[PDB]
Design a protein around this motif. Structure first.
Motif, PDB file in Angstrom:
ATOM      1  N   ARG B  43       0.824  -1.202   0.000  1.00 25.00           N
ATOM      2  CA  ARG B  43       0.000   0.000   0.000  1.00 25.00           C
ATOM      3  C   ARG B  43       0.861   1.255   0.000  1.00 25.00           C
ATOM      4  O   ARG B  43       0.473   2.272  -0.590  1.00 25.00           O
ATOM      5  N   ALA B  44       2.035   1.200   0.637  1.00 29.63           N
ATOM      6  CA  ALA B  44       2.889   2.381   0.717  1.00 29.63           C
ATOM      7  C   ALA B  44       3.474   2.749  -0.644  1.00 29.63           C
ATOM      8  O   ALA B  44       3.407   3.911  -1.061  1.00 29.63           O
ATOM      9  N   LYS B  45       4.042   1.779  -1.358  1.00 30.85           N
ATOM     10  CA  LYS B  45       4.699   2.101  -2.620  1.00 30.85           C
ATOM     11  C   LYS B  45       3.847   1.823  -3.850  1.00 30.85           C
ATOM     12  O   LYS B  45       3.966   2.548  -4.841  1.00 30.85           O
ATOM     13  N   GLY B  46       3.001   0.802  -3.825  1.00 32.02           N
ATOM     14  CA  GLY B  46       2.102   0.554  -4.933  1.00 32.02           C
ATOM     15  C   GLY B  46       2.646  -0.318  -6.035  1.00 32.02           C
ATOM     16  O   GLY B  46       2.005  -0.427  -7.085  1.00 32.02           O
ATOM     17  N   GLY B  48       2.907  -3.523  -6.200  1.00 34.30           N
ATOM     18  CA  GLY B  48       2.351  -4.851  -6.265  1.00 34.30           C
ATOM     19  C   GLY B  48       1.047  -4.918  -7.025  1.00 34.30           C
ATOM     20  O   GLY B  48       0.469  -3.899  -7.412  1.00 34.30           O
ATOM     21  N   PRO B  49       0.553  -6.133  -7.254  1.00 37.50           N
ATOM     22  CA  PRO B  49      -0.696  -6.312  -8.002  1.00 37.50           C
ATOM     23  C   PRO B  49      -1.973  -6.193  -7.184  1.00 37.50           C
ATOM     24  O   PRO B  49      -3.049  -6.429  -7.740  1.00 37.50           O
ATOM     25  N   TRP B  50      -1.910  -5.856  -5.895  1.00 37.19           N
ATOM     26  CA  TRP B  50      -3.144  -5.746  -5.123  1.00 37.19           C
ATOM     27  C   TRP B  50      -3.813  -4.390  -5.283  1.00 37.19           C
ATOM     28  O   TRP B  50      -4.916  -4.289  -5.829  1.00 37.19           O
ATOM     29  N   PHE B  51      -3.163  -3.330  -4.810  1.00 37.17           N
ATOM     30  CA  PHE B  51      -3.833  -2.040  -4.678  1.00 37.17           C
ATOM     31  C   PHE B  51      -3.561  -1.232  -5.937  1.00 37.17           C
ATOM     32  O   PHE B  51      -2.689  -0.364  -5.990  1.00 37.17           O
ATOM     33  N   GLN B  52      -4.325  -1.543  -6.980  1.00 39.78           N
ATOM     34  CA  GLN B  52      -4.223  -0.872  -8.273  1.00 39.78           C
ATOM     35  C   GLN B  52      -5.633  -0.478  -8.686  1.00 39.78           C
ATOM     36  O   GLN B  52      -6.343  -1.252  -9.332  1.00 39.78           O
ATOM     37  N   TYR B  53      -6.028   0.712  -8.312  1.00 37.26           N
ATOM     38  CA  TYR B  53      -7.344   1.207  -8.661  1.00 37.26           C
ATOM     39  C   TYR B  53      -7.359   1.638 -10.125  1.00 37.26           C
ATOM     40  O   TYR B  53      -6.400   2.255 -10.592  1.00 37.26           O
ATOM     41  N   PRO B  54      -8.422   1.310 -10.865  1.00 38.35           N
ATOM     42  CA  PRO B  54      -8.366   1.345 -12.337  1.00 38.35           C
ATOM     43  C   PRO B  54      -8.299   2.763 -12.883  1.00 38.35           C
ATOM     44  O   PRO B  54      -9.169   3.593 -12.615  1.00 38.35           O
ATOM     45  N   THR B  55      -7.250   3.028 -13.649  1.00 37.78           N
ATOM     46  CA  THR B  55      -7.054   4.298 -14.327  1.00 37.78           C
ATOM     47  C   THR B  55      -7.696   4.234 -15.712  1.00 37.78           C
ATOM     48  O   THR B  55      -8.535   3.373 -15.989  1.00 37.78           O
ATOM     49  N   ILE B  56      -7.320   5.169 -16.580  1.00 39.06           N
ATOM     50  CA  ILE B  56      -7.914   5.284 -17.903  1.00 39.06           C
ATOM     51  C   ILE B  56      -7.431   4.147 -18.794  1.00 39.06           C
ATOM     52  O   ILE B  56      -6.230   3.857 -18.863  1.00 39.06           O
ATOM     53  N   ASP B  57      -8.363   3.496 -19.484  1.00 36.72           N
ATOM     54  CA  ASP B  57      -8.011   2.513 -20.500  1.00 36.72           C
ATOM     55  C   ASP B  57      -7.723   3.231 -21.814  1.00 36.72           C
ATOM     56  O   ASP B  57      -8.592   3.930 -22.345  1.00 36.72           O
ATOM     57  N   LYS B  58      -6.515   3.054 -22.352  1.00 41.72           N
ATOM     58  CA  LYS B  58      -6.064   3.849 -23.489  1.00 41.72           C
ATOM     59  C   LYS B  58      -6.473   3.263 -24.835  1.00 41.72           C
ATOM     60  O   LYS B  58      -6.081   3.811 -25.871  1.00 41.72           O
ATOM     61  N   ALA B  59      -7.253   2.177 -24.854  1.00 37.43           N
ATOM     62  CA  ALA B  59      -7.667   1.594 -26.127  1.00 37.43           C
ATOM     63  C   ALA B  59      -8.645   2.493 -26.868  1.00 37.43           C
ATOM     64  O   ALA B  59      -8.706   2.457 -28.102  1.00 37.43           O
ATOM     65  N   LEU B  60      -9.403   3.310 -26.140  1.00 40.11           N
ATOM     66  CA  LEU B  60     -10.296   4.266 -26.775  1.00 40.11           C
ATOM     67  C   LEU B  60      -9.562   5.494 -27.295  1.00 40.11           C
ATOM     68  O   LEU B  60     -10.136   6.255 -28.080  1.00 40.11           O
ATOM     69  N   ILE B  61      -8.317   5.708 -26.875  1.00 42.47           N
ATOM     70  CA  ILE B  61      -7.522   6.811 -27.403  1.00 42.47           C
ATOM     71  C   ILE B  61      -7.092   6.432 -28.813  1.00 42.47           C
ATOM     72  O   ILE B  61      -6.178   5.624 -28.995  1.00 42.47           O
ATOM     73  N   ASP B  62      -7.746   7.007 -29.812  1.00 42.01           N
ATOM     74  CA  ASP B  62      -7.544   6.607 -31.199  1.00 42.01           C
ATOM     75  C   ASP B  62      -6.978   7.806 -31.949  1.00 42.01           C
ATOM     76  O   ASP B  62      -7.723   8.705 -32.352  1.00 42.01           O
ATOM     77  N   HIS B  63      -5.660   7.820 -32.118  1.00 42.96           N
ATOM     78  CA  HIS B  63      -5.014   8.862 -32.899  1.00 42.96           C
ATOM     79  C   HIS B  63      -5.334   8.686 -34.379  1.00 42.96           C
ATOM     80  O   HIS B  63      -5.344   7.570 -34.905  1.00 42.96           O
ATOM     81  N   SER B  64      -5.619   9.800 -35.040  1.00 43.85           N
ATOM     82  CA  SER B  64      -6.112   9.803 -36.411  1.00 43.85           C
ATOM     83  C   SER B  64      -5.887  11.195 -36.979  1.00 43.85           C
ATOM     84  O   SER B  64      -5.570  12.129 -36.236  1.00 43.85           O
ATOM     85  N   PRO B  65      -5.984  11.362 -38.302  1.00 40.86           N
ATOM     86  CA  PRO B  65      -5.979  12.727 -38.850  1.00 40.86           C
ATOM     87  C   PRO B  65      -7.241  13.506 -38.518  1.00 40.86           C
ATOM     88  O   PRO B  65      -8.319  13.205 -39.035  1.00 40.86           O
ATOM     89  N   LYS B  66      -7.107  14.531 -37.680  1.00 45.01           N
ATOM     90  CA  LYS B  66      -8.236  15.336 -37.225  1.00 45.01           C
ATOM     91  C   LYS B  66      -8.666  16.394 -38.230  1.00 45.01           C
ATOM     92  O   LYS B  66      -8.377  16.287 -39.423  1.00 45.01           O
ATOM     93  N   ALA B  67      -9.435  17.373 -37.759  1.00 47.75           N
ATOM     94  CA  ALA B  67      -9.838  18.511 -38.568  1.00 47.75           C
ATOM     95  C   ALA B  67      -8.835  19.655 -38.481  1.00 47.75           C
ATOM     96  O   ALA B  67      -8.364  20.153 -39.506  1.00 47.75           O
ATOM     97  N   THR B  68      -8.516  20.080 -37.276  1.00 52.71           N
ATOM     98  CA  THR B  68      -7.563  21.150 -36.998  1.00 52.71           C
ATOM     99  C   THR B  68      -6.152  20.579 -36.984  1.00 52.71           C
ATOM    100  O   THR B  68      -5.923  19.539 -36.357  1.00 52.71           O
TER     101      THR B  68
END
Lengths: 171, 71
Positions: B43-46, B48-68
């Motif tokens: 818990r102090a350093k983090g 290990g595989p126990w105390f890992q609260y779920p962050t952002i899943d980057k699979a939805l981050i889809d880089h592509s040619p935008k408009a701007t």
């Protein structure tokens, strides 16, 4: 039976009474009647029972143990070392209590045998009694009820360290 | 002797039972203290595989040619 060298007995000293005058002696007639009315039949009964015993043969042996090594050779926690250590120490404690019982029974028997002069031929047994009981008072006494073995070794270290400081002051 | 023969137990049986049982529960106590030390450092350093609260899943981050052009 018993060893004559652990429960010692001095040799017997018995006079031969010389009767001055002749009444004579009611207790001699009474002890001969006691012999004829008690001593013969109980001897015959015991001899019959001993023949019935010695028809077959039982035996019981004395339980004996080994020397599991020490508590001084056991580590920090190591519970399967301290267990044998402290049970060996507790059996030493029981047999040492019975050593004290034997010496105190010797002191009682020296009191009752030697009669109204206590201090003749009881100096040696009182001497060894104070010796062994001084050892007991030094070794097992002031630890209390929750003795395991470790308070005894702590008392051992504390006493020899205090006497080390005492002989350093005596140097 | 008959009472000890038909009902009771040898001191060998009970003695080795005590010794085995101390082995078992010494394993239990050492694993329990090691468990709480692992838990406090994890818990102090983090790491290990126990105390890992779920962050952002980057699979939805889809880089592509935008408009701007300057995103």
């Amino acid at each position: 039976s018993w060893d004559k060298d652990v429960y010692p007995e001095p040799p017997r000293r018995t006079p031969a009474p010389s009767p001055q005058t002749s009444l004579p002696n009611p207790i001699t007639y009474l002890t001969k009647a006691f012999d004829l009315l008690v001593d013969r039949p109980v001897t015959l009964v015991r001899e019959f029972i001993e023949r019935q015993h010695a028809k077959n043969k039982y035996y019981y042996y004395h339980r004996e143990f080994r020397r599991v090594p020490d508590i001084t050779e056991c580590h920090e926690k190591d519970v399967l070392c301290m267990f044998e250590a402290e049970m060996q120490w507790k059996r030493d404690y029981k047999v040492d209590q019975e050593i004290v019982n034997i010496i105190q029974e010797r002191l009682k028997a020296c009191q009752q045998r030697e009669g109204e002069s206590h201090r003749q031929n009881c100096a040696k047994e009182l001497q060894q009694f104070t010796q062994v009981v001084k050892a007991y008072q030094d070794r097992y006494h002031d630890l209390g009820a929750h003795y395991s073995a470790r308070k005894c070794l702590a008392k051992q270290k504390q006493r020899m360290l205090a006497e080390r400081k005492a002989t350093k002051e005596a140097a | 002797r008959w009472i000890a023969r038909t009902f009771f137990d040898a001191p060998e049986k009970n003695y080795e039972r005590t010794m085995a049982i101390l082995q078992i529960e010494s394993e239990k106590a050492e694993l329990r203290l090691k468990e709480l030390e692992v838990r406090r450092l994890m818990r102090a350093k983090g790491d290990g595989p126990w105390f890992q609260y779920p962050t952002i899943d980057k699979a939805l981050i889809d880089h592509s040619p935008k408009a701007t052009p300057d995103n």
